[PDB]
Design a protein around this nucleic acid. Structure first.
Ligand SMILES: [Zn+2]
Length: 264
DNA sequence: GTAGACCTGGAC
DNA sequence: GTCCA
DNA sequence: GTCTAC
């Protein structure tokens, strides 16, 4: 899940929990709770608070309660669902919040990588993990200029620069490869070796890609945007623009898909 | 930079 | 049995 | 998806 997936979850979950008051919280896999460290304290501070709103910052979901904010990261398998407290839980359910009306919010995560933090509202943006986070791609904060300042100062690949959440928030393996394809730029190339015409071009393809994926409810990998993917997950398949077999190597320590003729 | 963690169930 | 994200 | 260790 990247910005489009996390943003879709946000729009689809808010109306199912707004106004509900928390009555109890249960943890079946402690390590998921990062702050406060003691999972018993995390559970007790939320009791009695009402869900007032739900926001997003990069790839993080930000639950807004009475005085606190709950910060949740889904990593690779994390998923949410609301249901009746009288029915059986699905497997791999590690954290559950029970509301005073008999319903509950369930969090599942097969690999157990997800994380959760909670702080008073006014302190959330000044502390980890949201503190040293970059600007939103669909906002004036992100521009061709703000993308150059960072590129003209490093040897690392251009893909390695886009995966970094401090540079720009929200992009992942799927949308980084797609964006670089639409811009005609090889992923393994140096960030400093990019011209101005390329920078602006890359900025424009990232905005148009993230925007499109959102209007389609994200992509279903592992939702209808996966039908619009050009390179991701298409090793040894004819390119949609030129017909050259898509290739797959390894850049920045991650699997990488690209077209050898279209990108350069 | 690229293995190596942190975990687990479908792929081949 | 075993390699993958 | 991220963080850490040669
Ligand atoms: Zn091509």
């Amino acid at each position: 899940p990247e910005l489009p997936e996390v943003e879709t979850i946000r729009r689809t979950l808010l109306p199912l929990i707004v106004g509900k008051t928390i009555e109890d919280v249960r943890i079946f896999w402690p390590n998921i709770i990062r702050h406060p460290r003691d999972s018993e304290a995390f559970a007790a501070r939320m009791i009695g608070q009402t869900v007032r709103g739900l926001e997003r910052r990069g790839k993080f979901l930000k639950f807004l309660l009475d005085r606190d904010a709950l910060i949740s990261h889904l990593r690779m398998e994390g998923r949410y669902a609301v249901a009746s407290a009288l029915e059986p839980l699905e497997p791999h359910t590690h954290v559950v919040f029970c509301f005073t009306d008999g319903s509950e919010l369930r969090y599942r995560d097969v690999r157990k990588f997800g994380t959760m933090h909670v702080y008073a509202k006014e302190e959330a943006d000044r502390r980890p993990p949201l503190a040293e986070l970059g600007p939103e791609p669909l906002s004036p904060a992100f521009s061709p200029a703000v993308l150059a300042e960072r590129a003209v100062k490093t040897k690392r690949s251009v893909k390695a620069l886009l995966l970094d959440q401090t540079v720009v928030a929200g992009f992942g393996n799927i949308y980084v490869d797609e964006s670089l394809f639409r811009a005609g730029i090889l992923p393994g190339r140096p960030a400093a070796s990019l011209s101005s015409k390329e920078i602006e071009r890359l900025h424009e393809e990232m905005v148009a890609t993230i925007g499109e994926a959102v209007m389609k409810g994200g992509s279903t990998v592992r939702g209808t945007f996966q039908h619009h993917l050009y390179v991701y997950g298409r090793q040894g398949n004819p390119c949609k623009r030129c017909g050259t077999p898509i290739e797959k190597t390894v850049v920045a320590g991650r699997g990488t898909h690209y077209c050898p003729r279209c990108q350069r």
